[PDB]
Design a protein around this ligand. Structure first.
Ligand SMILES: [Zn+2]
Length: 140
């Protein structure tokens, strides 16, 4: 579990979005595993605007933050998980590291701020849904 809170937006894994998220929907994209809902309070997070490939992610199944190198966001084939079938996912970054389904929502951060959230795992990789292209998260 986990979310990004930027302005009056809440950014979550689409597959973990609540009824309250869907009832206050700003934007969602199944191909990216992302959903953004509206919030009443303002959030503590800054979105990175950059092409960093090094950062640190939170792994709930280890209660640890790990430094990683990661690929630039791309269209990747993901094997079946407890929450999705085998499929192609867009805007996905991969790193070598530990990820279980419940790790989804952990933040990946760089020197510039929040890069994305854990979205995929298995076979010694962790996948992160990028948010750095969502420039609209910082206005309106
Ligand atoms: Zn950066």
């Amino acid at each position: 579990s986990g979310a990004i809170y930027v302005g009056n937006y809440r950014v979550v894994n689409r597959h973990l979005a609540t009824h309250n998220d869907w009832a206050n929907l700003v934007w969602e994209d199944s191909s990216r595993d992302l959903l953004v809902s509206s919030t009443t309070a303002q959030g503590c997070d800054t979105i990175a605007r950059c092409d960093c490939q090094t950062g640190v992610y939170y792994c709930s199944s280890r209660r640890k933050h790990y430094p990683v190198s990661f690929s630039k966001p791309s269209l990747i084939f993901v094997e079946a998980s407890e929450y999705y079938p085998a499929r192609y996912q867009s805007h996905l970054m991969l790193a070598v590291g530990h990820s279980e389904p419940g790790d989804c929502g952990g933040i990946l951060r760089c020197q510039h701020g929040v890069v994305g959230i854990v979205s995929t795992g298995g076979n010694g990789l962790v996948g992160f849904a990028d948010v750095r292209d969502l420039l609209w998260l910082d206005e309106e």
